[PDB]
Write a protein that binds this ligand. Structure first.
Ligand SMILES: Cc1cc(O)cc2c1[C@@H]1O[C@@](C)(Cc3cc4c(c(O)c31)C(=O)c1c(O)cc(O)cc1C4(C)C)O2
Length: 245
């Protein structure tokens, strides 16, 4: 009966949520994508759909998806999944800011909820509902996710979207949070690509690992961390590599 909670939850910032990447041919993608980082494949479970989990050193990293006969998937390439208060929370604030929900709310195997929002031009913003964990996986340095960064032509706009679905604006109040949300938005276009694509950690040797395959060069500089490498995969998947150790 319109009661409020009496507990403030403050998750640990920095920890990424998740990152999935659809492909036309999972079999082939594993040959390209995994050739960049140098990961290993694993067998799928039986009884369920074919799911290849990409793990190494007994440490969780990422998973690959596929479409088969689905010409219009949900992912549409790399993207950053931001963790919201609730699937419905975010979706509910979408219209409050003046956006449009494209997908969700949906119940993926009653395990989680993924939905997309933004404008009807086809902008997909990864939104996951953190209930158990916020994607706190093993910190093996290299090979694990690094962070989430979106390159849009309207930092001021996207910022408004984030501050609304995540920022305090969501609940137009303070006290029942700390501020442990992860996101990043930069304004670029002429001198840098555009789209949703988190960063990843790899050795310097990974740079050419992609080149040799025939990756497309767009932008590999002008980053806050210094050395950056953004390549465009042949299928249309855009992602950024940062050299650290
Ligand atoms: C949204 C969606 C809706 C739908 O009707 C069918 C469907 C998907 C999508 O692609 C697949 C192949 C299955 C699938 C699986 C996941 C996600 C996903 O988008 C999709 C997903 O978003 C996600 C995540 O964000 C964090 C996780 O820890 C795990 C996942 C899993 C479960 C791997 O078919």
């Amino acid at each position: 009966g319109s009661h409020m909670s009496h507990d403030a939850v403050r998750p640990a910032p920095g920890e990424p949520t998740w990152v999935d990447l659809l492909t036309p041919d999972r079999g082939a993608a594993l040959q390209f994508y995994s050739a960049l980082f140098g990961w290993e494949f694993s067998t799928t479970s039986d009884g369920t759909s074919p799911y290849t989990m990409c793990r190494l050193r007994g440490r969780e990293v990422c998973s690959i998806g596929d479409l088969g006969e689905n010409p219009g998937p949900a992912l549409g390439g790399w993207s950053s999944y931001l963790s919201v208060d609730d699937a419905d929370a975010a979706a509910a604030a979408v219209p409050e800011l003046g956006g449009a929900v494209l997908l969700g709310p949906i119940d993926i195997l009653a395990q989680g909820r993924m939905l997309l929002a933004g404008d009807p031009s086809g902008h997909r913003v990864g939104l996951w509902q953190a209930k158990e964990h916020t994607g706190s996986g093993p910190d093996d340095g290299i090979g694990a996710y690094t962070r989430s960064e979106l390159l849009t032509g309207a930092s001021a706009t996207d910022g408004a979207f984030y501050r609304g679905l995540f920022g305090a604006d969501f609940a137009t109040e303070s006290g029942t949070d700390g501020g442990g949300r992860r996101a990043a938005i930069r304004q670029v276009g002429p001198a840098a690509p555009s789209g949703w694509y988190p960063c990843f950690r790899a050795q310097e040797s990974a740079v050419p690992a992609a080149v040799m395959l025939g990756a497309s060069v767009l932008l590999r500089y002008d980053c806050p961390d210094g050395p950056a490498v953004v390549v465009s995969a042949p299928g249309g998947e855009v992602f950024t590599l940062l050299l650290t150790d």
